[PDB]
Design an enzyme around this catalytic site. Structure first.
Site, PDB file in Angstrom:
ATOM      1  N   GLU A 291      42.838  49.340  34.709  1.00  0.00           N
ATOM      2  CA  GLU A 291      42.630  47.924  34.969  1.00  0.00           C
ATOM      3  C   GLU A 291      42.936  47.187  33.666  1.00  0.00           C
ATOM      4  O   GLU A 291      42.813  47.759  32.584  1.00  0.00           O
ATOM      5  CB  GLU A 291      41.193  47.604  35.392  1.00  0.00           C
ATOM      6  CG  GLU A 291      40.667  48.377  36.604  1.00  0.00           C
ATOM      7  CD  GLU A 291      41.247  48.055  37.973  1.00  0.00           C
ATOM      8  OE1 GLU A 291      42.084  47.137  38.049  1.00  0.00           O
ATOM      9  OE2 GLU A 291      40.890  48.741  38.970  1.00  0.00           O
ATOM     10  N   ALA A 292      43.336  45.920  33.772  1.00  0.00           N
ATOM     11  CA  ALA A 292      43.680  45.122  32.610  1.00  0.00           C
ATOM     12  C   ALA A 292      43.260  43.666  32.819  1.00  0.00           C
ATOM     13  O   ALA A 292      42.813  43.273  33.897  1.00  0.00           O
ATOM     14  CB  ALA A 292      45.167  45.238  32.348  1.00  0.00           C
TER      15      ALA A 292
ATOM     16  N   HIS B 222      38.208  48.493  43.943  1.00  0.00           N
ATOM     17  CA  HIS B 222      37.832  47.596  42.865  1.00  0.00           C
ATOM     18  C   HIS B 222      37.714  48.310  41.515  1.00  0.00           C
ATOM     19  O   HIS B 222      37.589  47.614  40.523  1.00  0.00           O
ATOM     20  CB  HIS B 222      36.558  46.807  43.210  1.00  0.00           C
ATOM     21  CG  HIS B 222      35.296  47.616  43.209  1.00  0.00           C
ATOM     22  ND1 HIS B 222      35.002  48.564  44.169  1.00  0.00           N
ATOM     23  CD2 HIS B 222      34.258  47.630  42.348  1.00  0.00           C
ATOM     24  CE1 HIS B 222      33.828  49.122  43.892  1.00  0.00           C
ATOM     25  NE2 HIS B 222      33.354  48.564  42.794  1.00  0.00           N
TER      26      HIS B 222
ATOM     27  N   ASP C  10      40.992  53.691  42.614  1.00  0.00           N
ATOM     28  CA  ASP C  10      42.437  53.680  42.798  1.00  0.00           C
ATOM     29  C   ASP C  10      43.026  55.070  42.547  1.00  0.00           C
ATOM     30  O   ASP C  10      43.969  55.484  43.218  1.00  0.00           O
ATOM     31  CB  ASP C  10      43.076  52.555  42.000  1.00  0.00           C
ATOM     32  CG  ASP C  10      42.897  51.164  42.604  1.00  0.00           C
ATOM     33  OD1 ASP C  10      42.367  51.060  43.729  1.00  0.00           O
ATOM     34  OD2 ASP C  10      43.272  50.176  41.938  1.00  0.00           O
TER      35      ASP C  10
ATOM     36  N   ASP D 196      45.072  55.640  36.477  1.00  0.00           N
ATOM     37  CA  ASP D 196      45.045  54.230  36.802  1.00  0.00           C
ATOM     38  C   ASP D 196      44.282  53.473  35.728  1.00  0.00           C
ATOM     39  O   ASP D 196      43.252  53.935  35.252  1.00  0.00           O
ATOM     40  CB  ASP D 196      44.417  53.953  38.154  1.00  0.00           C
ATOM     41  CG  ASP D 196      44.672  52.543  38.660  1.00  0.00           C
ATOM     42  OD1 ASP D 196      45.836  52.252  39.031  1.00  0.00           O
ATOM     43  OD2 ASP D 196      43.728  51.731  38.616  1.00  0.00           O
TER      44      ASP D 196
ATOM     45  N   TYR E  73      53.018  48.914  35.467  1.00  0.00           N
ATOM     46  CA  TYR E  73      51.677  48.615  34.979  1.00  0.00           C
ATOM     47  C   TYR E  73      51.194  49.654  33.965  1.00  0.00           C
ATOM     48  O   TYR E  73      51.166  49.395  32.766  1.00  0.00           O
ATOM     49  CB  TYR E  73      50.748  48.505  36.188  1.00  0.00           C
ATOM     50  CG  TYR E  73      51.101  47.419  37.193  1.00  0.00           C
ATOM     51  CD1 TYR E  73      51.400  46.124  36.796  1.00  0.00           C
ATOM     52  CD2 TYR E  73      51.128  47.698  38.552  1.00  0.00           C
ATOM     53  CE1 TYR E  73      51.697  45.137  37.720  1.00  0.00           C
ATOM     54  CE2 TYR E  73      51.426  46.723  39.486  1.00  0.00           C
ATOM     55  CZ  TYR E  73      51.724  45.440  39.068  1.00  0.00           C
ATOM     56  OH  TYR E  73      52.047  44.465  39.981  1.00  0.00           O
TER      57      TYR E  73
HETATM   58  O1  LIG Z   1      44.765  45.657  36.336  1.00  0.00           O
HETATM   59  C1  LIG Z   1      45.954  45.559  36.586  1.00  0.00           C
HETATM   60  C2  LIG Z   1      46.950  46.038  35.584  1.00  0.00           C
HETATM   61  C3  LIG Z   1      47.888  45.173  35.027  1.00  0.00           C
HETATM   62  C4  LIG Z   1      48.723  45.657  34.050  1.00  0.00           C
HETATM   63  F1  LIG Z   1      49.613  44.798  33.482  1.00  0.00           F
HETATM   64  C5  LIG Z   1      48.691  46.951  33.593  1.00  0.00           C
HETATM   65  C6  LIG Z   1      47.753  47.769  34.174  1.00  0.00           C
HETATM   66  F2  LIG Z   1      47.676  49.059  33.752  1.00  0.00           F
HETATM   67  C7  LIG Z   1      46.884  47.358  35.153  1.00  0.00           C
HETATM   68  N1  LIG Z   1      46.391  45.057  37.752  1.00  0.00           N
HETATM   69  C8  LIG Z   1      47.766  45.197  38.239  1.00  0.00           C
HETATM   70  C9  LIG Z   1      47.892  46.236  39.327  1.00  0.00           C
HETATM   71  C10 LIG Z   1      48.375  45.937  40.586  1.00  0.00           C
HETATM   72  C11 LIG Z   1      48.496  46.934  41.538  1.00  0.00           C
HETATM   73  C12 LIG Z   1      48.126  48.215  41.192  1.00  0.00           C
HETATM   74  N2  LIG Z   1      47.657  48.541  39.990  1.00  0.00           N
HETATM   75  C13 LIG Z   1      47.550  47.555  39.088  1.00  0.00           C
HETATM   76  C14 LIG Z   1      45.436  44.435  38.671  1.00  0.00           C
HETATM   77  C15 LIG Z   1      45.729  42.994  39.004  1.00  0.00           C
HETATM   78  C16 LIG Z   1      46.191  42.680  40.279  1.00  0.00           C
HETATM   79  C17 LIG Z   1      46.440  41.371  40.646  1.00  0.00           C
HETATM   80  C18 LIG Z   1      46.240  40.347  39.746  1.00  0.00           C
HETATM   81  C19 LIG Z   1      45.783  40.642  38.479  1.00  0.00           C
HETATM   82 CL1  LIG Z   1      45.594  39.356  37.365  1.00  0.00          CL
HETATM   83  C20 LIG Z   1      45.527  41.953  38.101  1.00  0.00           C
HETATM   84 CL2  LIG Z   1      44.935  42.306  36.508  1.00  0.00          CL
HETATM   85 MG   LIG Z   2      46.816  50.519  39.501  1.00  0.00          MG
END
Ligand SMILES: O=C(c1cc(F)cc(F)c1)N(Cc1cccnc1)Cc1cccc(Cl)c1Cl
Ligand SMILES: [Mg+2]
Ligand SMILES: O=C(c1cc(F)cc(F)c1)N(Cc1cccnc1)Cc1cccc(Cl)c1Cl
Ligand SMILES: [Mg+2]
Lengths: 218, 218
Positions: free
Chosen positions: B16-17, B179, B184, B14, B120
């Site tokens: 975060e971005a 978080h 995750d 997993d 993602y």
């Molecule tokens: O951090 C990420 C993310 C985004 C990517 F493009 C690529 C990546 F590897 C991770 N999110 C997407 C996500 C959603 C569900 C499960 N796993 C990840 C979290 C997220 C959620 C809602 C609004 C925002 Cl703005 C963000 Cl960042």
């Molecule tokens: Mg994820």
């Protein structure tokens, strides 16, 4: 005076092994948890402090070259056969390189922090590196033994100094996990977060070059 | 027929971005949890299965080249400024090398497992590698999207397929930590341990070369 300036990263460190030092043991598990000094210097109402949000963690199991003792297996929940069944590899060049790459992600100076590290974790790490002909590979690092630190800090504020004894004394309850390297690192982190600014001051004042740690053997 | 034979290590993954794919985001955190197939194929009476004793874990925070959105910061608890305050480094060659060294500790074939990974985690990882001119660095790997797997498995056994929705449905309770990347990964591992032999069979039957994942951008 600070012998080596302020430490920028504290790397909480714990290893599991096949036995105690007198058995010429080998690593079965290691955990590094790298915390920037700001998490202790400038901490952001629970019984136990939460860990910092921003941390780097590495936890690896290692196939040792010998059997774990029954006593080691009872306390660590590992055996050499089970490590092998999970395809674990020995302590090798790739592992040393991985450790160094992980440390290179942390601002220097680095300080390893381990509980009874002078007896267990630090000399064993040095021995494993020496067996690879990588003596001095990690000698950019500094180190401190948290049992020394916590003895000094408890004396300044005012028995067993085992990790579990200290934890119970400070937090009035036993620590979650006593059976993994990660669990021991997290418990140590919690103890160090009790009076974090004092702990960090002590670390800065007493940090020692890792190269001063003689290998356990070899 | 198994297209690539049996996967020996499942690497729960997993990241975060800074934002969602349409924002051309960058990595702020990554977690890999490597589990040998035996932990699922041959599992050793709680509500939620305990994680396997023998696992390898890597969790790293990363300084992105842009601000995190407010929405990203609310869900991840990270911001670019705070990552910088903790001395975090960018996604660079050393990080790519560290990832590969970690994977090299695992028996092959390797299979990355991520929830909505096709949307993602997988394309973002490919994009970060491409920006380093390291396209194909991780193409020894295989990958599966757990949302695809869990949809198939729930259909075979008998709504939202978010991680939290599935977790609550299976275990009748919300997951501990929502978080962090590690949180995750651990929640996903728990879901995959619900019917582990079936999950592993599905992974073996549907594993795809990581090189078939197009980069998110670049
Ligand atoms: O951090 C990420 C993310 C985004 C990517 F493009 C690529 C990546 F590897 C991770 N999110 C997407 C996500 C959603 C569900 C499960 N796993 C990840 C979290 C997220 C959620 C809602 C609004 C925002 Cl703005 C963000 Cl960042
Ligand atoms: Mg994820
Ligand atoms: O795994 C190690 C160990 C041994 C070493 F030499 C070097 C090392 F890095 C780790 N143990 C010692 C220890 C004790 C307290 C705190 N931290 C570690 C655990 C242990 C306890 C009791 C009996 C046994 Cl036989 C064993 Cl192995
Ligand atoms: Mg210890």
């Amino acid at each position: 005076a600070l012998p080596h300036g302020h430490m920028q990263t504290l790397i909480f460190f714990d290893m599991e092994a096949t036995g105690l030092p007198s058995s010429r043991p080998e690593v079965t598990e290691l955990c590094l948890l790298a915390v920037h000094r700001c998490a202790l210097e400038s901490p952001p109402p629970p019984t136990v402090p939460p860990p910092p949000r921003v941390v780097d963690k590495l936890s690896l199991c290692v196939a040792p070259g010998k059997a774990c003792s029954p006593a080691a297996s009872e306390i660590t929940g590992l055996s050499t056969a089970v490590l092998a069944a999970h395809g674990r590899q020995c302590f090798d060049d790739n592992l040393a390189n991985l450790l160094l790459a992980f440390l290179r992600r942390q601002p220097q100076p680095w300080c390893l922090v381990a509980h009874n590290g002078d007896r267990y974790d630090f000399p064993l790490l040095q021995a494993e590196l020496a067996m690879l002909g990588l003596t001095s590979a990690l000698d950019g690092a500094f180190c401190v033994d948290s049992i020394t630190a916590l003895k000094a800090l408890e004396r300044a504020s005012s028995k067993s100094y085992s990790l579990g004894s200290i934890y119970t004394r400070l937090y009035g309850q036993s620590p979650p996990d006593s059976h993994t390297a990660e669990g021991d690192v997290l418990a140590l982190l919690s103890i160090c977060q009790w009076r974090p600014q004092a702990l960090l001051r002590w670390v800065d004042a007493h940090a020692r070059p890792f190269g001063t740690i003689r290998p356990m053997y070899g």
